[PDB]
């Protein structure tokens, strides 16, 4: 029961993508085998490199395995090795990675708590709002979409909403209609005082946008939020 | 109406039994000719066929561009009498094509386009590749691609030893070819099928083609890469995109040659649609300025 790690490892670094991927969805049971110090150095290094494997499907297989792993290590050993891995995926070249990494943070907040998120996660997510590339600027809005679900009323309002409302004046229309799509999603998680004096005026401005799409989604948001 | 034959002299202006010498002895080849000016189109038929497969094509093409036609009966086929009719390797048959050229002209080889059907497609290539035609300016391969031909070996082995062994009359041979689906054009069947069979005894196959199975690997192997390596304008005509293998697909998507698909045809596309095969080769010729239109 102390040797099948050599076997597991061999396959995790193999040429064929097929062996790599399936043996990855096998690590959970091998973690519960005896993983207090074993996962630390005998197996995590292999996971760390697989985080940046050139075959995006293999990166997906790690991202989806992360929450169960981050669980067994605990909060105090996450800001260590794995925080950078989690953040760097958000900015990966492949959208499906950025997207999986987005929903990955949610699963992380589910384990470690909304407090932990306000400290560690949320600021690094707020960074991408200023990113020159619009594909990244939108990742911020996708994270806020996901995070609003498990952060609650107070934390979302305080540390997330201002960033969303400030993005209403983005030079790129794709960002602007994702703003209207965000408020539609996050709106329910806000007291009625915030929706009326802080949110609604912004959605009203967006309906008067130059772009076809930004208009449409600003309208639909107002409808779905009973504001109209 | 009839399934009764039509003589070659309806489509070709003349013929010649070309004499060729080598090591053991001397051979006579048989070519069917038509036309007086423009480039020569050297035509090479499929397996178990004869120059007569090109009969209708010739009529259609001559009335499109000023060209000459040399439709060659390959060894063991048609009326080609060879001291050694058992050796049907890719090299020997290509060597033959080259020699017919020298024997007919030699001193004065005129512009030549090679056009090969099936087996004659592979030979045309092997001839072009070895640069046996010193005036060759173009190459056309009809309905042969390596990968698929190699994949078909066993199944065409099956077809052959399924064919009728003899025919009551030349009429029945013509009838059978249309009814079986070998040739979809009755006009073409009535003239070409006489080069497929001989008679004494009922009519039988001019060549027991099942015997030639040992040379089939040598015919199609590496034919795609070979075809692609001939640095001259190339044409490839298929009955369907299904014919393509890996190497010619990469090749054609990289724009290395020209392909026309004629899905209204069976395997003998020049016999099934002589009209449109003439049209394609005609356009090809005018576009590269190898020939002149009427």
């Amino acid at each position: 029961s102390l040797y099948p790690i050599a076997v597991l490892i061999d396959e995790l670094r193999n040429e064929d993508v097929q062996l790599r991927l399936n043996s990855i969805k096998k690590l959970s049971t091998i973690a519960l085998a005896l993983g207090v110090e074993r996962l630390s150095q005998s197996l995590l290094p292999a996971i760390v490199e697989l985080a940046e494997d050139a075959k995006w499907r293999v990166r997906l297989a790690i991202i989806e395995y992360m929450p169960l792993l981050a669980g067994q290590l605990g909060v105090e050993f996450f800001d260590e090795k794995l925080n950078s891995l989690c953040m760097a995926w958000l900015v990966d070249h492949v959208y499906a990675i950025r997207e999986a990494a987005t929903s990955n943070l949610k699963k992380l907040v589910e384990k470690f708590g909304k407090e932990w998120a306000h400290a560690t996660i949320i600021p690094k997510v707020l960074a991408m709002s200023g990113d020159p590339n619009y594909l990244h600027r939108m990742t911020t809005l996708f994270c806020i979409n996901v995070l609003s679900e498990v952060c609650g009323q107070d934390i979302t309002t305080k540390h997330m909403l201002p960033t969303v409302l400030r993005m209403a004046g983005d030079p790129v229309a794709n960002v602007r209609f994702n703003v209207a799509k965000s408020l539609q999603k996050i709106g329910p998680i806000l007291d009625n005082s915030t929706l009326q004096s802080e949110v609604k005026p912004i959605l009203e401005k967006l309906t008067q946008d130059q772009d076809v799409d930004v208009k449409y989604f600003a309208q639909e948001a107002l409808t779905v939020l009973s504001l109209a | 109406r009839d399934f009764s034959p039509v003589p070659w002299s309806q489509y070709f202006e003349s013929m010649e039994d070309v004499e060729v010498e080598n090591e053991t002895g001397k051979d006579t080849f048989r070519v069917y000719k038509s036309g007086s000016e423009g480039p020569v189109l050297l035509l090479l038929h499929g397996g178990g066929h004869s120059a007569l497969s090109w009969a209708v094509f010739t009529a259609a093409i001559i009335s499109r561009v000023q060209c000459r036609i040399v439709a060659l009966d390959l060894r063991s086929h048609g009326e080609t009498k060879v001291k050694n009719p058992e050796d049907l390797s890719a090299e020997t048959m290509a060597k033959d094509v080259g020699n017919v050229v020298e024997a007919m002209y030699g001193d004065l080889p005129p512009p030549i386009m090679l056009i090969g059907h099936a087996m004659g497609g592979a030979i045309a290539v092997h001839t072009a590749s070895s640069n046996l035609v010193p005036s060759l300016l173009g190459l056309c391969m009809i309905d042969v691609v390596e990968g698929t031909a190699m994949d078909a070996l066993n199944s065409m082995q099956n077809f052959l030893r399924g064919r009728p062994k003899t025919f009551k009359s030349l009429e029945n041979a013509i009838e059978w070819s249309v009814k079986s689906g070998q040739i979809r054009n009755l006009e073409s069947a009535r003239v070409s099928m006489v080069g497929q069979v001989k008679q004494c005894k009922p009519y039988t196959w001019r060549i027991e083609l099942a015997k030639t199975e040992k040379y089939w690997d040598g015919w199609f192997r590496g034919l795609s890469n070979l075809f692609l390596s001939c640095p001259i304008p190339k044409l490839l005509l298929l009955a369907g995109v299904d014919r393509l293998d890996k190497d010619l697909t990469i090749g054609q998507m990289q724009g290395k040659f020209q392909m026309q698909v004629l899905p209204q045809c069976g395997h003998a596309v020049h016999e099934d649609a002589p009209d449109k095969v003439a049209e394609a080769v005609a356009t090809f010729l005018i576009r590269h300025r190898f020939a002149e239109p009427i």
Partner: protein, 294 residues
């Protein structure tokens, strides 16, 4: 109607064809939108430039997993949405549905495949037959293809088209002057833009492809400099890496169909242009009748 479109998109995402009736309406409104578009369609960055897709529906889904979902990511497609008759319907129907739903969010140019000529013969017409019973859907798409813009210009700097340059076009205004509302001609300026290839021998050459022209670096540099262009971006040629620079970075070729025709083994690629026109290339893998040639 906006929400009927969303329904259709959701459905096509599951590889499930629209009804004949629905295709008809889609195409009616697509014509109406594309009428307002120019022969040189002005596009503003950030956009993702995409090359040949070839009816490979699942690899297009893969494309979206790489570049991102529409309308979030802006895309510019350079043609060849249809090829063989497997999933070509879903592929084209989806991209058209996206255009109708989101005019400003995607641009779909015309390729050499978006023609009555090639579609009848390569597979698309057969697919329409097997999936609808009639072929009205072939007619609704080929009438539509006549309306696709020919070229596109990203922020007045990067020039986009399926094929390449023409000896009949010096300036962008020459392209603007064309009547594009027709079946792709065999000859002339329009054909060339869809059929021409970049080439390693300077000057113009007769295209071994059958249509268009090979063009050299000297032509690229001349063309770019006169129109104030920094790059010519085009598709049309299978490249084993998904993308390829040539002509000293005056031209890039982007092929977006991985493992083309399920046998080639090539990579696919898309080119992301950011908010300031910085290029980055993303390569991806694929997502996970006579039988006688003798």
């Amino acid at each position: 109607f906006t929400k009927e479109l969303d329904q259709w998109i959701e459905q096509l995402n599951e590889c499930k064809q629209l009804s004949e009736s629905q295709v008809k309406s889609l195409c009616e409104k697509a014509k109406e939108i594309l009428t307002k578009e120019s022969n040189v369609q002005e596009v503003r960055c950030p956009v993702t430039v995409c090359g040949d897709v070839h009816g490979q529906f699942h690899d297009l889904m893969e494309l979206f997993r790489i570049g991102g979902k529409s309308p979030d990511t802006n895309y510019l497609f350079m043609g060849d949405y249809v090829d063989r008759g497997y999933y070509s319907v879903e592929t084209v129907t989806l991209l058209v549905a996206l255009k109708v739903r989101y005019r400003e969010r995607i641009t779909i140019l015309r390729g050499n495949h978006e023609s009555r000529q090639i579609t009848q013969v390569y597979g698309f017409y057969d697919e329409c037959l097997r999936k609808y019973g009639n072929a009205n859907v072939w007619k609704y798409f080929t009438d539509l293809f006549d309306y696709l813009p020919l070229t596109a210009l990203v922020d007045g700097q990067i020039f986009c088209l399926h094929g390449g340059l023409s000896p009949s076009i010096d300036t962008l205004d020459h392209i603007r002057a064309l009547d594009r509302l027709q079946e792709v001609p065999h000859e002339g300026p329009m054909c060339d833009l869809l059929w021409s290839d970049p080439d390693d021998r300077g000057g113009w050459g007769i295209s071994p492809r059958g249509a268009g022209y090979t063009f050299g670096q000297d032509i690229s540099e001349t063309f770019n400099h006169a129109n104030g262009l920094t790059l010519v971006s085009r598709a049309h040629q299978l490249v084993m890496e998904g993308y390829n620079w040539c002509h000293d970075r005056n031209v890039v070729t982007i092929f977006s169909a991985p493992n083309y025709c399920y046998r080639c083994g090539n990579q696919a690629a898309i080119m992301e242009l950011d908010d300031t026109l910085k290029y980055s290339f993303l390569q991806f893998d694929p997502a996970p009748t006579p039988d006688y040639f003798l």
